[PDB]
Amino acid sequence: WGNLTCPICKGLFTAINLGLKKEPNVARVGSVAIKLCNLLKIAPPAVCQSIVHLFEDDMVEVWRRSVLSPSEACGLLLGSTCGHWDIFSSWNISLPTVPKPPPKPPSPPAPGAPVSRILFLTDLHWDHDYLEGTDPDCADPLCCRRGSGLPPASRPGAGYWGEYSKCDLPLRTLESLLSGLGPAGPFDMVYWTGDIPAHDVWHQTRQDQLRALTTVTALVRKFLGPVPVYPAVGNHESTPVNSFPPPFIEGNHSSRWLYEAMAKAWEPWLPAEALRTLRIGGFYALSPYPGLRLISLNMNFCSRENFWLLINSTDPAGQLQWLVGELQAAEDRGDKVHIIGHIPPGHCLKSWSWNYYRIVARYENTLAAQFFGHTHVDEFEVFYDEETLSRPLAVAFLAPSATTYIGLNPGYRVYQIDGNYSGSSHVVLDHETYILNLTQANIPGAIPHWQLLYRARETYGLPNTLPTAWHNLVYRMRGDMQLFQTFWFLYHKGHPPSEPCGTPCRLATLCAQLSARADSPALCRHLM
Numbered sequence: 001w002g003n004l005t006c007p008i009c010k011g012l013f014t015a016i017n018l019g020l021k022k023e024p025n026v027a028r029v030g031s032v033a034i035k036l037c038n039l040l041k042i043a044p045p046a047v048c049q050s051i052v053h054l055f056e057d058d059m060v061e062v063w064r065r066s067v068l069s070p071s072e073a074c075g076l077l078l079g080s081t082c083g084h085w086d087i088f089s090s091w092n093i094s095l096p097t098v099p100k101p102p103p104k105p106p107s108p109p110a111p112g113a114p115v116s117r118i119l120f121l122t123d124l125h126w127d128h129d130y131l132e133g134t135d136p137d138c139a140d141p142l143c144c145r146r147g148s149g150l151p152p153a154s155r156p157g158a159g160y161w162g163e164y165s166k167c168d169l170p171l172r173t174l175e176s177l178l179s180g181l182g183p184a185g186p187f188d189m190v191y192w193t194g195d196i197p198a199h200d201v202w203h204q205t206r207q208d209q210l211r212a213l214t215t216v217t218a219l220v221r222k223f224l225g226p227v228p229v230y231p232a233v234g235n236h237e238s239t240p241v242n243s244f245p246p247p248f249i250e251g252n253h254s255s256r257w258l259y260e261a262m263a264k265a266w267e268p269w270l271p272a273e274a275l276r277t278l279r280i281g282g283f284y285a286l287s288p289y290p291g292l293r294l295i296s297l298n299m300n301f302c303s304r305e306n307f308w309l310l311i312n313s314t315d316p317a318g319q320l321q322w323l324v325g326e327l328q329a330a331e332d333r334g335d336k337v338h339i340i341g342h343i344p345p346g347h348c349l350k351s352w353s354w355n356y357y358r359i360v361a362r363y364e365n366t367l368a369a370q371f372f373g374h375t376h377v378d379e380f381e382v383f384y385d386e387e388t389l390s391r392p393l394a395v396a397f398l399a400p401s402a403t404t405y406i407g408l409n410p411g412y413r414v415y416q417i418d419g420n421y422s423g424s425s426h427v428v429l430d431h432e433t434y435i436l437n438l439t440q441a442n443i444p445g446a447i448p449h450w451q452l453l454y455r456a457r458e459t460y461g462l463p464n465t466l467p468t469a470w471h472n473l474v475y476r477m478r479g480d481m482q483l484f485q486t487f488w489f490l491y492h493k494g495h496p497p498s499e500p501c502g503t504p505c506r507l508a509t510l511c512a513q514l515s516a517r518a519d520s521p522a523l524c525r526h527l528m
């Protein structure tokens with residue numbers, strides 16, 4: 001009588017569910033997990049215990065409601081007859097039935113046309129506990145801070161402004177960055193795409209994260225005054241890291257604490273309609289100029305590390321569908337769109353990344369620019385047509401981090417964009433990157449001087465910065481090692497590794513530049 005296997009299975013995981021709601025059961029989960037953390041020497045025992053205690057409540061709940069829920073587990077184990085396993089199942093959003101206009105590249109701007117200057121800040125990762133002189137090569141996942149201890153007598157401690165290691169930034173270096181903006185300005189707007197807290201991820205309270213949010217927010221507001229700042233939500237803003245429950249999760253373990261703090265912190269910059277969307281799911285749209293829409297995406301609903309998506313990964317918060325409606329509205333008015341976000345779309349979950357790719361291809365004429373960060377390095381992602389994966393039609397700019405993490409100079413970015421006038425293409429025309437050379441800045445008594453590292457069109461000889469120039473650059477770099485070495489230099493903000501990047505390293509790096517869609521190896525067919 002195997003007619004009972006499904007009854008008993010469901011009875012098992014129903015009892016599993018009830019047991020895992022009990023906090024002493026959750027603590028049992030945490031204790032074993034910590035001993036394995038110590039046994040597998042993942043981190044120091046202090047970090048192992050702290051991070052499991054911080055994560056255990058939310059993670060046990062998600063597993064209880066997804067992988068261990070009776071309908072899911074028994075569906076995996078006994079098949080569609082018993083339950084239904086649909087964890088990370090494929091999904092698709094709906095495009096409107098409006099015919100796609102003919103593909104049309106942006107027009108060259110007329111002589112003397114207005115140029116809008118956009119400051120781009122990402123991955124600031126302020127470390128409230130940064131401490132000069134401490135060990136940069138400590139045993140914790142983040143060093144140069146209180147509790148990192150002392151270096152050996154053979155190596156120096158963490159530099160005053162930062163270190164070339166697994167360390168984040170003292171607030172004074174963030175202050176130095178914004179205080180040196182004058183040469184690079186003036187700015188019409190600032191795009192600020194996430195990651196305010198540091199990587200002290202094993203002990204972050206909601207108050208620490210809010211303190212990071214409110215302190216840095218006030219700092220940029222002090223140095224940029226009247227200039228609008230459009231933020232986007234990074235993966236480090238929440239606690240625990242990457243924990244962004246979609247709006248179908250209510251109660252105090254939801255993201256309400258964080259989104260509302262953002263709506264109050266960013267009220268000076270965001271219109272009422274933006275603040276409403278922001279409070280719901282951490283994304284919004286607004287109009288910087290007549291004929292220009294800006295859309296700030298919360299890419300944590302695309303993230304491979306947002307463990308809440310194990311419950312349901314299908315277009316969380318309805319964001320992609322909301323994006324389509326916003327983009328079609330822009331197409332209807334003839335507006336152009338900027339997209340800003342944190343995690344670049346090539347690094348998203350499979351289904352999300354594929355649907356985003358399809359949206360970008362549909363709205364190629366309407367999308368004018370895309371801006372992401374999160375990787376901390378200086379790179380890009382080229383988008384191609386759906387039909388042949390060979391006509392370049394969009395490019396995402398991945399700007400490098402202000403934080404040193406890991407081992408880099410601090411950096412930031414400025415875009416020259418086809419400006420504020422009727423008929424403008426609103427596309428990026430050129431960009432520039434500024435760095436703080438820590439080797440020089442950390443000399444005792446020196447005053448930090450942020451330097452221009454490079455300008456895009458000048459150093460690569462680009463006629464413009466449209467998608468085809470970046471496509472072309474990748475294939476020039478396939479055959480020109482010196483050119484690729486330049487790019488590899490700039491990629492690390494002027495502080496590349498000493499291990500040379502040979503043939504496999506180059507091909508893997510070039511393949512990432514063409515991988516705007518996750519898990520699409522065909523995109524790199526011409527590289528390997």
Ligand SMILES: *[C@@H]1O[C@H](CO)[C@@H](O[C@@H]2O[C@H](CO)[C@@H](O[C@@H]3O[C@H](CO[C@H]4O[C@H](CO)[C@@H](O)[C@H](O[C@H]5O[C@H](CO)[C@@H](O)[C@H](O)[C@@H]5O)[C@@H]4O)[C@@H](O)[C@H](O)[C@@H]3O)[C@H](O)[C@H]2NC(C)=O)[C@H](O)[C@H]1NC(C)=O
Nearest residue numbers: 086091092093094095248311312313314315316317318321
């Ligand atoms: C995880 O979340 C997703 C979404 O949040 C859940 O998917 C929804 O599931 C419910 C069932 O519980 C579906 O309800 C059915 O919808 C039928 C038709 O609905 C159409 O119109 C909807 C409202 O305008 C519209 O959202 C939807 O568009 C999209 O969904 C289609 C799949 O449903 C998809 O193929 C399209 O590409 C498009 O993106 C529909 O066209 C209706 O006939 C049924 O009676 C019933 O109402 C929702 O439609 C689902 N919505 C989406 C976007 O998929 C999913 O169940 C959750 N998973 C778990 C395990 O909870």
Ligand SMILES: *[C@@H]1O[C@H](CO)[C@@H](O[C@@H]2O[C@H](CO)[C@@H](O)[C@H](O)[C@H]2NC(C)=O)[C@H](O)[C@H]1NC(C)=O
Nearest residue numbers: 409435436437438439440441451453493494495
């Ligand atoms: C950061 O500052 C260091 C320190 O001066 C620069 O390194 C020097 O680079 C020049 C040019 O290659 C050499 O002649 C010196 O010998 C270097 N000094 C040392 C101590 O290595 C470095 O080039 C700067 N980096 C950037 C990106 O500006």
Ligand SMILES: *[C@@H]1O[C@H](CO)[C@@H](O)[C@H](O)[C@H]1NC(C)=O
Nearest residue numbers: 188287288289290420421422
């Ligand atoms: C942009 O141009 C329009 C039309 O000339 C003007 O009204 C507006 O003040 C300008 N600036 C912004 C930020 O919209």
Ligand SMILES: C[N+](C)(C)CCOP(=O)(O)O
Nearest residue numbers: 123195235236374375376
């Ligand atoms: C993603 N990364 C590990 C390469 C860069 C640092 O991560 P993160 O600070 O953006 O979360």
Ligand SMILES: [Zn+2]
Nearest residue numbers: 123195374376
């Ligand atoms: Zn970051």
Ligand SMILES: [Zn+2]
Nearest residue numbers: 195234235374
């Ligand atoms: Zn990040």
